[PDB]
Swiss-Prot record, chain A:
GO cellular component: mitochondrial inner membrane; mitochondrion; respiratory chain complex I
Leader sequence residues: none
Protein name according to UniProt: NADH dehydrogenase [ubiquinone] iron-sulfur protein 4, mitochondrial
Subcellular location: Mitochondrion inner membrane
Mitochondrion keyword on record: yes
GO molecular function, one term: NADH dehydrogenase (ubiquinone) activity
GO biological process, one term: cellular response to oxygen levels
Assembly with partners or alone: This is a component of the iron-sulfur (IP) fragment of the enzyme. Interacts with BCAP31 and TOMM40; the interaction mediates its translocation to the mitochondria; the interaction with BCAP31 is direct.
Family recorded in the similarity comment: Belongs to the complex I NDUFS4 subunit family.
Keyword terms, alphabetized: Electron transport, Membrane, Mitochondrion, Mitochondrion inner membrane, Phosphoprotein, Respiratory chain, Transit peptide, Transport
UniProtKB/Swiss-Prot annotation, chain D:
EC top class, as a word: translocase
Residues of the full protein shown: 79 to 463 of 463
GO biological process: aerobic respiration; cellular response to oxygen levels; gliogenesis; mitochondrial electron transport, NADH to ubiquinone; mitochondrial respiratory chain complex I assembly; neural precursor cell proliferation; neurogenesis; proton motive force-driven mitochondrial ATP synthesis
Annotated source species: Mus musculus (Mouse)
Subunit organization: Core subunit of respiratory chain NADH dehydrogenase (Complex I) which is composed of 45 different subunits. Component of the iron-sulfur (IP) fragment of the enzyme. Interacts with NDUFAF3. Interacts with NDUFAF7. Interacts with CERS2.
Source organism superkingdom: Eukaryota
Effect of disrupting the coding gene: Knockout mice show early perinatal death and major defects in the CNS, compromising especially the postnatal development of dorsal cortex, corpus callosum, hippocampus and cerebellum. Neonatal neurogenesis and gliogenesis are deeply impaired.
Protein name, as recorded: NADH dehydrogenase [ubiquinone] iron-sulfur protein 2, mitochondrial
Catalytically driven reaction(s): a ubiquinone + NADH + 5 H(+)(in) = a ubiquinol + NAD(+) + 4 H(+)(out)
From Swiss-Prot, chain E:
Chief location: mitochondrion
Keywords (A to Z) from UniProt: Acetylation, Electron transport, Membrane, Mitochondrion, Mitochondrion inner membrane, Respiratory chain, Transit peptide, Transport
Residues the record lists as N6-acetyllysine modifications: K60, K82
Any Gene Ontology CC annotation: respiratory chain complex I
Subcellular location field: Mitochondrion inner membrane
Functional summary from the UniProt entry: Accessory subunit of the mitochondrial membrane respiratory chain NADH dehydrogenase (Complex I), that is believed not to be involved in catalysis. Complex I functions in the transfer of electrons from NADH to the respiratory chain. The immediate electron acceptor for the enzyme is believed to be ubiquinone.
Top-level division of the source organism's lineage: Eukaryota
Membrane topology, as annotated: Peripheral membrane protein
Family: Belongs to the complex I NDUFS6 subunit family.
Portion of the parent chain present: 31 to 113 of 116
Name of the gene this protein is made from: Ndufs6
Organism: Mus musculus (Mouse)
Protein name listed in UniProt: NADH dehydrogenase [ubiquinone] iron-sulfur protein 6, mitochondrial
Swiss-Prot record, chain F:
Organism: Mus musculus (Mouse)
Subunit description: Complex I is composed of 45 different subunits.
PTM text: Acetylation of Lys-94 is observed in liver mitochondria from fasted mice but not from fed mice.
Phenotype when the gene is knocked out: Lethality around embryonic day 9 (E9). Conditional knockout in the central nervous system does not lead to any visible phenotype until mice reach 10-11 months of age: then mice become lethargic, lose motor control and have difficulty maintaining balance. Defects cause loss of other complex I subunits and reduced NADH dehydrogenase activity.
Membrane topology category: Peripheral membrane protein
GO biological process, one term: proton motive force-driven mitochondrial ATP synthesis
Modification sites for N6-acetyllysine: K26, K32, K42, K56, K94
InterPro entries xref list: NDUFA5 (IPR006806)
Location in or out of the cell: Mitochondrion inner membrane
Name of the protein: NADH dehydrogenase [ubiquinone] 1 alpha subcomplex subunit 5
Length: 118, 114, 263, 385, 83, 112, 95, 198, 178
């Protein structure tokens, strides 16, 4: 038989994350925009949640960038806004969702460019 | 809601298991400090056990608790059946790492991102 | 009312009368390979890289410029509409100078990808290529225009989005070069957008000439503070120093454009 | 049963194996092998790399069979793309596939003996190995860890002259196997330490997923190369060396026999390799020839995109298994439409074999455990992945 | 010092690295070495620089030497050609 | 008659036809409890009946081995009682029932 | 090689094999270095005609898996035809 | 373009129906890839029953377990997708039975059905965190003895959170939070243009 | 096609002659003596070892060995910083940052191959369009300190100048193949 729990699945205790990176890390759920350089829209389809950016100090010996934040390069991809919000809640990371913004329909017709008076 | 029970039907039954594990660790701390020649005090270690067992005191859900002891039991097994040598155990004490202050002024003075 | 039903591969999408064939594919979700068509720029039909095949029709139609009509089935991936792209891409590439490891629109090319996705694997142009003298259009835009696919989006933007009306086509044949007839710099705000809008890397940014390459750039979405329109922008950072700020679309505030100052 | 924690004593090696054991004097009561001393993340790292830049990981998964492993990923990526390699490339892969089997068996038989205490077979056959490595180097550039077998065929045609040398060697290697034999197959002592040690039943071998010589040694007839042909291993003719009274000695004899049968397959490949190209002609999957990318625009674009971004495999998932020298090596490669994989569980013939150590070495002496780790050809790279 | 004027400041400590050691630099600097090669006076409006050696060189590109004032320079070699 | 089966552990079973007829008839019996139109009952009854019929029909074990495949006859014996064990197990499992639970939505959508 | 006949004879005997015929050390039998320059063959798809990629791109003509028994008399069927027994070899059945 | 025989896509398809019919209480979906591979999908409760039928059925003997793995689709409510690939040496065919398990909803163990799984199930717990009831001895296999966190989860940082160095003061190896000297450069590689309808 | 190894086709019934032959095999260790003969035989074979410093094990032109950056005959370094050598490196070894040189040409301000990170795959050799980065023949570059193994543009360019003559010969031999 099933048991009842109203407790938001929080599994922060099982994930195995250091305390500092669960209480000081804000992740943003956003649908990636399109670099204006290209006109393809296949990278503006799935929602992604990305952890907040952290220190990137220069390395003294070779000048390479060096980072102390483990969750930096991690960007998880989630198909829908609801599912991504769920991941933040059970993992205990703070979230600030940004609504998808899709190009509004625009009316175009080759005839217009040859308008008597535009 | 409407979840399936992993091993404990309710926080009550689950807590029973935590009690057992605590006892287990409590009885074991002394042995480890001797079979690993660790440079710690049994009392000190036993407090650490308490620390951990409470670090997760907030969990309210029965399922999460049950896994927590499964995992906890596994750790004990690695320390009583000794497969975890000192380096592994002492890590719990975070002996070498320098503690970080949590005071705002302290962080301000040191790190860009607190 | 005002809702024709056109089928994109039999999906019965319904569109307001007036929607182009390319637009009909978009609502189903398909994306016609396109050059010279920008949403906020007038339809020109220059490239003809968008030829699709409405069902039961002798010739393929220009997606971006064909008012859709009731009943039409687009057959976007029809064997025909692939020869109509496998054979156009043959042409754009034929006169193209292969300096892709110079073209800093390396990974930001809508012509390699549309070639790697919708075009052929080889070339048959055993003949010689062409070369067009470069132009010092300004101190911000580096026009290595031997790259130009004569797609006329610059001449549009430079006339329609910005009112410069300077850039224009000069000549006919395969030496139509889209550069200012006399060398007058393209001095206007909104100038740098040409970079972002030329899919080819013919004219690109001169300060960000060769400092990076796009796959590396980590892209963080932020807000313009130089001016009070608060235009949305994406700051492209590599190994911790900002390399480029390019626009990200906000319908209401900056719809895909940013000022010369804030980039 | 005083736990001895043997194996961090570098006693059977094959990698680093902490075989915690409980031994009543010189009898083993229970063996609990520990693993992960060589876990390195190979499965997670691959998710962050493109298909072609994850090919070098496969050579490192079990590096005594450097290439045969590469063929398994190749095949897998080719299936997902529904592309097949050109005819010459297929024969090559079978040519170097087999050469690699010999290399593994020379490793397994001679390293087995070194732990047993016979040291001269290793030096005899490591010289032959050496000569083979040189084939690798003159074909790939690297002695081992070549990266020659790529997802769409081979990387570069064989040098002009290799086939002839892969002949001279093959023409003679037999005698070298024959010699080892005159030293071990019938030694009055090899037999004893090997015969009737680690017998595995037929039903139990299938149950514990042994899938290798270990099954074949018990008499089960299964060679994925004959049952489910991959590449052109169908066009060749070889005899699987099945065994009876499966035990360390019998399986050994099987490994010496596949060394023999692989020379039969190599001969053919040299006799019948076709004229042709060594990589698919789809610039979409295979990188364009350097003369072409330096004279044709479509080829540069295809070179730039392939090296910088990737194949862009169509979304799907496949489990493709070959017959790597150790046993069934399989890659379950789940793939989203992206150029970089999503999952790539490597099935290692070896994760299953080690598990069997417990059910094989029961009521056995310390020396028996050393013999059984040898008869499983455990390379900790594949097990730990 | 180096090709790019990389010279640790008089106070920088990476100079400790060079203490008791040679800071590796190359006397042969490209910016200068290309200059030495003279402008090729071709007699065709557009010429191609395959890079020298064909397949053993750089991707083939055609240069427009039409501008009478300036000289075409291969984005690859740096070689210059004038009509 | 044979000296031994290829498989190491398996041992030659004398009276193999009798041993198979015993196991085959048992299974048929157990299946008799399965629900009438239960899929497992109809399918396995068909397989087992054909296997017996052949075992009854063939008095030569070598040809018997060819007729129902099975490699060596000893294996067929192991497969039959393995099936007999599962038939007993499934009666307890009641897998003939309808799906336990529908998959959470979008659970099986791979492109993700 | 380069062994006095007697040593060779002792060698061949003690080993029981004509090891001289198949020496391990390589001498002037190995492919000479600097083998001639190679002009490799260009494969298919290099035709300049009737070479449309759309007609040679198995990469994405592949389709989403076929689905059977989605949740959203009859004879028994096996995973595949029962396997065929392997046959003993004829060159060397045993050993 | 690879050669495809539809003989298999038909044989395997039929078998799929056969399995489904015989085990309808658990089979949710049964598909054959375009690569001629069957992939019965079962409710997690059908782990024991569906495997056993395949291990011990005359018309479907699937004796050895090729592999047990768990892809992790973070979006999917049930995060893990335990996949069991099986081989039938009798019918020379492989099938894959895949179930779904969330982080704290354990799956049954099949060590009973195939003892091969004794190790792989420990591997799935160590890397992904799925738990297997009735497992003889479930304990980390690949990760370090004191490792905290399940590594192959998509939500775990590649470099991880801890790295080891020898400290003289304490004369013993000591974890410290990871500090990397050149962070993993995260090249963005997806192109903004799709390839086909799929 | 299968083959039985270690399967006794039949039960040869002991015949005194057979028994004696066998008993002699156990009593006078006949097979053990057979094994000794094999090793005595090789003792007389020529050893295959090479004087390592004086003689070197043969490596053909494709040997990957140690990284070098080549220069055009004129003296202009070949690299034009397209940076796809960085993109395809499997280990993340190559780090490249570039800016337009004063001449106006494209060039790399910093090119750092971390050789300890590099796994010598040879893809960089493959990927370069101008073929500026090549796998040089030298394999002997063992270094006392870890820092020496990290290589900046100046070491690689210097490595390129030192080994250019052989690198050119090696690329000359193998380019038709590629
Ligand atoms: C002791 C009595 C001599 C033993 C002897 O001469 O053995 C070689 C001589 C030829 O043997 P091999 O294996 O044909 O020699 C390889 C080449 O043919 C012959 O080898 P090679 O082509 O290199 O010939 C040149 C070689 C020729 O050197 C020799 O053959 C004479 C070696 C004498 C060693 C004493 O001289 C050298 O290379 C320099 C080494 C000279 C000897 C070094 C060791 C001297 C030890 C002195 C104290 C003991 O042995 C015999 O004639 C039959 C011996 C049967 C023994 C049973
Ligand atoms: C000159 C150097 C000579 C070295 C001889 C040994 C190495 C060469 C062996 C070649 C070979 O393969 O044949 C072996 C052969 C190979 O035979 P086989 O094992 O293949 O089978 C033949 C024997 N039957 C058929 C009966 C099984 O072995 C023998 O012939 C028998 C050897 C018996 C040895 C008994 C122990 C050693 C002798 C002890 C008594 C003392 C003798 C003198 C001691 C020293 C006194 C100074
Ligand atoms: C009157 C009648 C006289 C009959 C005499 C018979 C021969 C006398 C010596 C017999 C020794 C006993 C014997 O038969 O062999 C024992 C053992 C082989 O035993 P095995 O075949 O394993 O049988 C086990 C059965 N439970 O033998 C061994 O395994 C020995 C172990 C191997 C050690 C190395 C063997 C090779 C040595 C080669 C050089 C020998 C030189 C001897 C002479 C040196 C100079 C004096
Ligand atoms: C010296 C060596 C140090 C090693 C210490 C030890 O091995 C590590 C370890 O504690 S292993 C993890 C223990 N963690 C649990 O066992 C879960 C506890 N579960 C709860 O705490 C619940 O929230 C509960 C409702 C019970 C609160 O109730 P309560 O406060 O405990 O009474
Ligand atoms: S534009 Fe620049 S990048 Fe795109 S193809 Fe032409 S050259 Fe290569
Ligand atoms: S410049 Fe860019 S935009 Fe203007 S035409 Fe040439 S390509 Fe089209
Ligand atoms: S690829 Fe060759 S040229 Fe392009 S950057 Fe790397 S090295 Fe310089
Ligand atoms: S987009 Fe259709 S004409 Fe250019
Ligand atoms: Zn040039």
């Amino acid at each position: 038989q099933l048991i009842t729990v109203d407790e938001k699945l929080d599994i922060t205790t099982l994930t195995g994350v250091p305390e500092e990176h669960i209480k000081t890390r804000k992740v943003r759920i956003f649908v990636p925009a399109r670099n204006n350089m290209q006109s393809g829209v296949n990278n503006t389809k799935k929602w992604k949640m990305e952890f907040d950016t952290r220190e990137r100090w220069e390395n003294p010996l070779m000048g390479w960038a060096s980072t102390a934040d483990p969750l930096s390069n991690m960007v998880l991809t989630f198909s829908a806004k609801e599912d991504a919000i769920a991941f933040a809640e059970k993992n205990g990371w703070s979230y600030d969702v940004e609504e998808k913004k899709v190009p509004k329909p625009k009316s175009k017709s080759y005839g217009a460019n040859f308008s008597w008076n535009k | 809601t409407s979840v399936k029970p992993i091993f404990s039907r309710d926080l009550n039954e689950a807590k029973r298991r935590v009690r057992e594990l605590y006892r287990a660790w409590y009885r074991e701390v002394p042995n480890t400090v001797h079979l690993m020649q660790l440079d710690i005090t049994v009392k000190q270690g036993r407090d650490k056990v308490r620390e951990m067992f409470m670090k997760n005191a907030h969990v309210t859900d029965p399922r999460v608790v049950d896994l927590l002891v499964i995992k906890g039991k596994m750790e004990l097994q690695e320390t009583i059946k000794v497969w975890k040598q000192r380096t592994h155990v002492m890590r719990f004490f975070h002996e070498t790492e320098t503690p970080r202050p949590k005071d705002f002024l302290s962080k301000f003075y040191m790190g860009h991102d607190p | 009312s005002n809702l024709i039903e056109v089928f994109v591969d039999g999906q019965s999408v319904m569109v307001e009368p007036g929607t182009t064939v390319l637009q009909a594919c978009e609502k189903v979700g398909m994306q016609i390979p396109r050059f010279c068509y920008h949403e906020r720029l007038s339809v020109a039909g220059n490239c003809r890289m968008c030829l699709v095949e409405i069902e039961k029709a002798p010739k393929v139609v220009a997606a971006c410029a064909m008012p859709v009509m009731k009943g039409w089935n687009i057959l976007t991936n029809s064997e025909k509409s692939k020869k109509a792209r496998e054979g156009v891409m043959e042409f754009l590439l034929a006169n193209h100078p292969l300096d892709c490891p110079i073209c800093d629109q390396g990974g930001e090319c809508d012509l390699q990808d549309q070639s790697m996705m919708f075009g052929s694997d080889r070339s048959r142009f055993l003949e010689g290529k062409r070369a067009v003298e470069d132009k010092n259009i300004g101190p911000l835009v580096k026009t290595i225009m031997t790259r130009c696919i004569q797609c006329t989006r610059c001449i549009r933007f430079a006339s329609e989005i910005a009112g410069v009306d300077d850039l224009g086509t000069t000549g006919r044949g395969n030496d139509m070069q889209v550069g200012t007839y006399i060398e007058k710099m393209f001095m206007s705000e909104l100038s740098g957008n040409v970079i972002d809008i030329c899919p080819v890397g013919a004219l690109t940014s001169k300060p960000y000439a060769f400092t990076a390459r796009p796959w590396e750039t980590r892209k963080t979405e932020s807000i313009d503070v130089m001016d009070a329109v608060g235009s949305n922008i994406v700051v492209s950072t590599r190994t911790g120093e900002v390399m480029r700020i390019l626009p990200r679309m906000h319908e209401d505030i900056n719809e895909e454009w940013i000022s010369d100052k804030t980039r | 049963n005083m736990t001895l924690n043997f194996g961090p004593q570098h006693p059977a090696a094959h990698g680093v194996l902490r075989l915690v054991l409980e031994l009543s004097g010189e009898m083993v009561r229970k063996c609990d092998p520990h693993i992960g001393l060589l876990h390195r993340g190979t499965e997670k790292l691959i998710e962050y790399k493109t298909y072609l830049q994850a090919l070098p990981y496969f050579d490192r998964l079990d590096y005594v069979s450097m290439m045969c492993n590469e063929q398994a990923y190749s095949i897998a990526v080719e299936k997902l793309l529904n592309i097949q390699p050109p005819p010459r490339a297929q024969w090559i892969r079978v040519l170097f596939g087999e050469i690699t089997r010999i290399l593994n068996h020379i490793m397994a038989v001679t390293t087995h003996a070194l732990d047993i205490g016979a040291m001269t077979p290793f030096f005899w056959m490591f010289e032959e190995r050496e000569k083979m490595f040189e084939f690798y180097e003159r074909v790939s550039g690297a002695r081992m860890h070549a990266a020659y077998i790529r997802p769409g065929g081979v990387h570069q045609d064989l040098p002009l002259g290799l086939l002839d040398d892969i002949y001279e060697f093959s023409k003679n290697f037999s005698l070298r196997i024959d010699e080892v034999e005159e030293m071990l197959t019938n030694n009055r002592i090899w037999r004893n330490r090997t015969v009737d040690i680690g017998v595995v039943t037929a039903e139990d071998a299938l149950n514990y997923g042994f899938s290798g010589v270990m099954l074949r040694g018990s008499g089960i007839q299964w060679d994925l190369r004959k049952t489910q042909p991959y590449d052109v291993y169908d066009q060749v003719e070889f005899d699987v060396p099945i065994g009876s009274r499966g035990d360390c000695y019998d399986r050994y004899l099987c490994r010496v026999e596949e060394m023999r049968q692989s020379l039969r397959i190599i001969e053919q490949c040299l006799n019948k390799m076709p004229p042709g190209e060594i990589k698919v002609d789809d610039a979409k999957v295979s990188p364009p020839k350097r003369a072409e990318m330096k004279t044709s625009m479509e080829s540069l674009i295809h070179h730039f995109k392939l090296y910088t971004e990737g194949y862009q495999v169509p979304p799907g998932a496949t489990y493709t298994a070959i017959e790597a020298p150790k046993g069934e090596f399989g890659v379950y490669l789940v793939s989203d439409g992206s150029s970089r994989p999503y999952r790539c569980k490597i099935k290692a013939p070896g994760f299953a074999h080690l598990a069997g150590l417990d059910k094989m070495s029961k009521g056995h002496m310390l020396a028996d455990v050393v013999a059984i780790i040898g008869t499983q050809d455990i390379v900790f790279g594949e097990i730990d992945r | 010092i180096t090709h790019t004027g990389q010279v640790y400041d008089e106070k920088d400590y990476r100079r400790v690295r060079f203490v008791d050691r040679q800071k590796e630099v190359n006397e042969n600097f490209a910016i200068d070495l290309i200059a030495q090669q003279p402008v090729n006076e071709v007699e065709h409006r557009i010429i191609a620089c395959d890079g020298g050696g064909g397949a053993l060189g750089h991707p083939k590109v055609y240069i427009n030497l039409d501008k009478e004032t300036k000289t075409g320079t291969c984005g690859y070699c740096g070689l210059q050609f004038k009509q | 008659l044979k000296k031994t089966t290829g498989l190491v552990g398996l041992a030659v079973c004398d009276t193999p036809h009798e041993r198979l007829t015993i196991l085959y008839t048992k299974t048929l019996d157990i299946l008799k409890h399965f629900p009438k139109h239960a899929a497992y009952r109809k399918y396995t009854e068909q397989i087992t009946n054909e296997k017996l019929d052949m075992v009854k029909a063939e008095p030569d074990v070598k040809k018997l081995e060819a007729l129902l495949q099975g490699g060596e006859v000893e294996e067929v014996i192991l497969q039959a009682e393995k099936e007999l064990s599962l038939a007993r197990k499934m009666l307890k499992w009641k897998p003939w029932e309808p799906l336990v639970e529908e998959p959470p939505a979008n659970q099986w959508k791979w492109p993700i | 090689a380069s062994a006095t006949r007697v040593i060779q004879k002792l060698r061949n005997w003690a080993s029981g094999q004509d090891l001289q015929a198949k020496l391990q050390l390589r001498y002037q039998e190995i492919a000479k270095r600097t083998q001639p320059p190679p002009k490799l063959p260009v494969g298919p798809s290099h035709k300049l005609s009737n070479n449309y990629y759309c007609t040679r791109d198995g990469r994405r003509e592949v389709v989403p898996p076929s689905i059977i028994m989605s949740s959203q008399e009859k004879k028994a069927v096996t995973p595949a035809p029962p396997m065929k027994r392997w046959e003993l070899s004829k060159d060397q059945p045993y050993l | 373009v690879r050669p495809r025989s539809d003989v298999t896509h038909k044989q395997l398809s039929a078998f799929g129906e056969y399995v489904a019919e015989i085990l309808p209480k658990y089979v949710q979906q049964v598909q054959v890839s375009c690569l001629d591979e069957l992939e019965i999908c079962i409710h997690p409760d059908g782990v024991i029953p569906t495997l056993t039928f395949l291990r011990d059925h005359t018309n479907a003997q699937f004796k050895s377990l090729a592999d047990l793995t768990a892809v992790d689709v973070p979006t999917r409510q049930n995060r893990f997708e335990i996949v069991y690939n099986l081989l039938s040496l009798r019918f020379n065919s492989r099938i894959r039975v895949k179930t779904y398990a969330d982080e704290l909803t354990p799956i049954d163990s099949i060590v009973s059905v195939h003892i091969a799984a004794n190790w792989y199930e420990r591997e799935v717990w160590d890397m992904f965190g799925v738990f297997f009831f009735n497992h003889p001895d479930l304990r980390r296999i690949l990760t370090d003895y004191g490792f905290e966190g399940h590594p192959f989860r998509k939500d775990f940082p590649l470099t991880g959170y801890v790295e080891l160095r020898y400290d003289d003061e304490v004369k013993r190896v000591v974890a410290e939070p990871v500090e990397l000297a050149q962070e993993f450069r995260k090249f963005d590689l997806n192109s903004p243009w799709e390839a086909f309808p799929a | 096609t299968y083959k039985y190894v270690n399967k006794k086709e039949q039960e040869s019934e002991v015949d005194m002659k057979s028994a004696t032959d066998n008993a002699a095999r156990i009593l006078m260790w006949t097979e053990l003596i057979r094994g000794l003969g094999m090793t005595l035989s090789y003792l007389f074979r020529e050893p295959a070892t090479i004087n390592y410093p004086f003689e070197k094990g043969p490596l053909s032109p494709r040997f990957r060995g140690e990284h070098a950056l080549r220069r055009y005959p004129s003296g202009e370094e070949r690299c034009i910083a397209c940076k796809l050598c960085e993109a395809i490196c499997p280990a993340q070894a190559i780090t490249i940052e570039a800016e337009p040189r004063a001449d106006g040409s494209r060039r790399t301000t910093r090119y750092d191959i971390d050789m300890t990170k590099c796994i010598y795959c040879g893809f960089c050799q493959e990927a370069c369009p101008v073929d500026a980065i090549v796998e040089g023949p030298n394999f002997e570059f063992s270094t006392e300190t870890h820092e020496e193994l990290l290589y900046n543009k100046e070491k690689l360019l210097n490595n390129g100048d030192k080994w250019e003559a052989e690198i050119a010969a090696n690329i000359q031999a193998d380019y038709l193949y590629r």
